[PDB]
Design a protein around this nucleic acid. Structure first.
Ligand SMILES: Nc1ncnc2c1ncn2[C@@H]1O[C@H](COP(=O)(O)OP(=O)(O)OP(=O)(O)O)[C@@H](O)[C@H]1O
Ligand SMILES: Nc1nc2c(ncn2[C@@H]2O[C@H](COP(=O)(O)OP(=O)(O)O)[C@@H](O)[C@H]2O)c(=O)[nH]1
Ligand SMILES: [K+]
Ligand SMILES: [Mg+2]
Ligand SMILES: [Mg+2]
Ligand SMILES: [Mg+2]
Ligand SMILES: [Mg+2]
Ligand SMILES: [Mg+2]
Ligand SMILES: [Mg+2]
Lengths: 51, 101, 349, 208, 80
RNA sequence: AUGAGGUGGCAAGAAAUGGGCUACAUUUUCUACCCCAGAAAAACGAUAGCCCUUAUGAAACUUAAGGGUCGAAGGUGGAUUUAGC
């Protein structure tokens, strides 16, 4: 898959840049993407749609 | 004093969705991962289903803000095609001109 | 056109002039490996004339000044597409065949790494795959090329074919070749045994080996063969490719590893890739290093004029304006002196 | 048309421009002087001054083109010419010197003569006298004759009777047959002539 | 690992091992055991060869680089 | 209550017909490349059917994508008819 040195360096870079450190699958990255953005309902363009 | 009852219903749906957005976000986050136990995910599923129907964001319909038209609405201006054409033709929308090329 | 037809005497004096191959030599030395278009031209003209060019001359010089005591040297003919790598390699193959070398000629190593209907599993090593059709075809061609030494060469081991059938030390290599050809299931094993025997016996002075491999870059590249599980297969899993890789090492002596790069027919390589590293990759360059790269370039004006004159003498350029200076200039511009482009254009002009 | 009516099609011919000035009649000199002040359409990407250019073969390639695949059409044309030349060379080599003098090896000449043989002299057109159209025989102008010959060649090659036979070989074989005055294309020309003769009695129905 | 490097280092590399083994085989064929790893690698020919190989591996590969490598390898292998 | 709100539900095919997509292949199919190759070739041919997975969603047998599986009708189409300088 990946060299051990490259994998450890990638994990270190992830820790330094604040990304997800633990190994996680695309299914569970949905949590990160959900919480990294406002809900569509919370967005002003939605709840402030009508004058 | 909205244009019609459909617009009124949509306004209520938007208000309730805004009110329940955070709770739905958290519960859906619980449900949308393979990490937590599936029993916990199932109870989260029943909770999110037990939340009121109108809180569901998908039920929000983007209607024209001036004639409650449910289709042919330009999201950028929130106006149906008819109203947008009216304003653009009369020249009351800045920078919008007939396209010829 | 030169009166000289011996592939050992021609030198810089014959540069840019033609060199004939007799029908017998063409049917014996070259039952495979000649370019398809050159084969069509040979059939049409009834003659096989190769222009003598600096790449072939230099490689012949090296092979004549070679010291068989030293480990076999790797020569790699590289150049743009259609510049003449394959035909220079064929010229050197003819020279060595006339000098009585044993020619181990792989006509296109690319064919072994793509478009294979029959991909069985090797019985000698279950982790490797067999290519019986290609193995049998190449064994037939090898027998045709080197039948003369085939009975004079003996094996030096015991080679089991089935749980009961086997070949014994002291048997002719013709027995191995015949077993491989006749029993198509043992073709890959016969190829491997032949390669091993030739490599080992070249060190004993029994003869001089010329391992002439076209499209050598295919061995250490990728492959377009998929396992039954739709899984890609790297070249090493192929028994033929692995054995040829072993052959490509200079650990032995008593011969020369001549090879030619060929982007045409390669897999996962861009059209304009022609340089040694660009075509071989890190693995291929590591394996071949050290090696002597020989550049095959487009025709110089003298060679271009010679080839045009050859076609005109054959009456191939049937267009009424071809003999004119203007027609010659147009041909030169269109082909940019590229041998393949010039030949293709003259094929219909 | 992005070209205004004032635009004239270019005349791409080296000899025309290299012609000596003294050899020009007054009208020719006037034409040149007029062209000196006329807008000219840019040369189309199909024709050049190349001495190997052949308008007939270019038009055949265009007619053979399918969906803008000029590369493939040109490839088929050159493959056909190469196949014809190879077959003629094979016949020339396998033939005795007595008939080698007559055996033709120029593929361009073979193609031109094959199309010329395929050209129909008379066609059938609907002509109307009194309110009824009839397939009256009529002479075919040169453009129509050449087009019909080329189209018949292409369609006969495209027929599905020849299976797993590539267009190069199909067209080379048909062109050779036409050159020797045989084959389905010449048969179609003869069928057209036979139908015209059978309806000969209706010639007067023509008014022009 | 070697794969985890962006700079090509000739020392203790496959190219170095291959050229060293080739030189050892050549000297063994000459039957003169006046050789050693340091003795072989100290010669200027090996310096030029490693320079050319490093140039090919790191710098952009072009005709000039290939010609330099060819000359170095010819000199090393005593074929000209 | 011909007004308003809530839950659930239909939105299918006997069959015809209009438009479009895919094809019937060799100027074709698969692969590499983006045009100098190798294989395929009675196979070509579904974007349909069935099973699984994934994406969105509170809700997917009924939406989309992917994979698996199957390899179907068809073999350039009658009068008639559409478009294009
Ligand atoms: N030395 C030569 N003498 C005669 N013809 C030659 C020579 N070199 C090339 N040709 C012509 O070019 C064609 C063969 O090209 P060749 O196979 O040598 O090119 P290549 O670059 O090795 O091929 P590839 O495109 O696979 O790399 C034939 O038409 C042949 O007549
Ligand atoms: N069937 C068979 N093949 C042999 C035999 N010896 C060598 N070969 C061939 O050569 C290969 C083995 O080469 P060898 O020198 O043993 O090296 P190895 O492949 O690393 O084991 C086999 O895969 C065969 O293709 C033998 O006795 N029987
Ligand atoms: K139709
Ligand atoms: Mg909606
Ligand atoms: Mg080649
Ligand atoms: Mg009501
Ligand atoms: Mg399906
Ligand atoms: Mg779900
Ligand atoms: Mg099928």
């Amino acid at each position: 898959s990946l060299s051990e040195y490259a994998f450890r360096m990638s994990r270190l870079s992830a820790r330094l840049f604040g990304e997800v450190t633990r190994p996680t699958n695309s299914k569970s990255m949905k949590v990160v993407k959900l919480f990294s953005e406002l809900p569509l309902a919370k967005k002003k363009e939605t709840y402030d749609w009508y004058p | 004093h909205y244009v019609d009852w459909r617009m009124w219903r949509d306004v209520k749906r938007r208000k309730m969705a805004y009110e329940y957005a955070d709770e739905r976000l958290r519960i859906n986050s619980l449900r949308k991962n393979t990490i937590l136990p599936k029993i916990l995910q199932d109870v989260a599923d029943e909770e999110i289903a037990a939340l009121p129907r109108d809180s569901c964001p998908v039920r929000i319909r983007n209607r024209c803000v001036m004639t409650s038209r449910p289709r042919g609405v330009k999201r950028r201006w929130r106006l149906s095609r008819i109203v947008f054409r009216h304003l653009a033709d009369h020249g009351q929308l800045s920078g919008i001109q007939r396209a010829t090329w | 056109r030169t009166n000289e037809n011996d592939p050992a005497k021609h030198g810089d004096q014959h540069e840019g002039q033609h060199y004939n191959i007799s029908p017998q030599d063409l049917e014996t030395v070259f039952p495979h490996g000649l370019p398809p278009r050159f084969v069509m031209q040979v059939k049409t003209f009834s003659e096989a004339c190769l222009m003598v060019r600096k790449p072939a001359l230099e490689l012949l010089h090296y092979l004549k000044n070679t010291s068989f005591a030293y480990p076999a040297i790797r020569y790699l003919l590289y150049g743009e597409k259609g510049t003449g790598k394959t035909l220079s390699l064929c010229h050197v193959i003819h020279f060595c065949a006339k000098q009585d070398w044993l020619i181990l000629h792989i006509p296109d190593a690319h064919l072994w790494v793509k478009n294979c209907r029959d991909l069985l599993q090797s019985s000698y090593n279950k982790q490797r795959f067999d290519q019986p059709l290609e193995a049998s075809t190449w064994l037939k061609n090898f027998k045709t090329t080197n039948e003369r030494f085939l009975n004079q060469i003996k094996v030096q081991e015991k080679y089991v074919w089935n749980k009961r059938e086997s070949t014994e030390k002291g048997s002719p290599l013709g027995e191995v070749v015949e077993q491989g050809i006749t029993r198509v299931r043992n073709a890959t094993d016969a190829v491997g045994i032949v390669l091993k025997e030739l490599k080992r016996q070249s060190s004993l002075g029994m003869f001089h080996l010329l391992v002439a491999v076209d499209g050598i870059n295919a061995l250490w590249g990728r492959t377009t063969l998929k396992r039954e599980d739709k899984s890609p297969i790297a070249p090493e899993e192929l028994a033929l490719v692995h054995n040829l890789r072993k052959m490509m090492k200079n650990d032995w002596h008593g011969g020369a590893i001549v090879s030619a790069l060929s982007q045409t027919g390669s897999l996962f390589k861009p059209r304009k890739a022609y340089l040694p590293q660009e075509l071989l990759g890190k693995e291929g360059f590591d394996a071949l290093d050290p090696f002597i790269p020989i550049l095959v370039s487009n025709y110089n004006p003298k060679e271009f004029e010679s080839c045009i004159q050859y076609y005109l003498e054959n009456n191939w350029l049937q267009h009424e304006k071809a003999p004119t200076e203007e027609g010659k200039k147009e041909l030169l511009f269109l082909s940019n002196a590229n041998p393949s482009l010039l030949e293709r254009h003259c094929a219909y002009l | 048309s992005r070209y205004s009516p004032e635009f004239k099609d270019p005349l791409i011919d080296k000899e025309y421009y290299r012609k000596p000035v003294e050899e020009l009649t007054e009208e020719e000199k006037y034409v040149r002087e007029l062209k000196k002040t006329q807008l000219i359409k840019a040369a189309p990407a199909g024709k050049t001054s190349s001495v190997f250019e052949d308008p007939v073969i270019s038009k055949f390639t265009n007619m053979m083109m399918i969906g803008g695949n000029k590369v493939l059409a040109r490839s088929l044309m050159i493959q056909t010419l190469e196949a014809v030349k190879r077959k003629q060379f094979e016949k020339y080599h396998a033939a005795s010197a007595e008939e080698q003098a007559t055996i033709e090896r120029n593929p361009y000449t073979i193609f031109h003569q094959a199309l010329k043989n395929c050209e129909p002299m008379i066609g059938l057109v609907p002509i109307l006298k009194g309110g009824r159209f009839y397939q009256v025989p009529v002479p075919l102008p040169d453009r129509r004759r050449r087009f019909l010959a080329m189209k018949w060649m292409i369609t006969e090659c495209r027929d599905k009777k020849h299976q797993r036979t590539l267009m190069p070989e199909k067209l080379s074989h048909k062109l050779l047959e036409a050159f020797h005055n045989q084959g389905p294309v010449i048969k179609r020309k003869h069928d057209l002539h036979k139908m015209a003769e059978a309806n000969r009695a209706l010639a007067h129905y023509r008014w022009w | 690992t070697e794969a985890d490097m962006e700079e090509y280092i000739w020392e203790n590399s496959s190219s170095e091992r291959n050229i060293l083994e080739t030189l050892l085989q050549m000297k063994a064929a000459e039957k003169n055991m006046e050789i050693n790893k340091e003795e072989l690698l100290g010669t200027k020919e090996i310096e030029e060869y490693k320079k050319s190989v490093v140039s090919l591996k790191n710098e952009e590969e072009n005709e000039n680089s290939i010609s330099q490598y060819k000359e170095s390898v010819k000199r090393l292998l005593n074929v000209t």
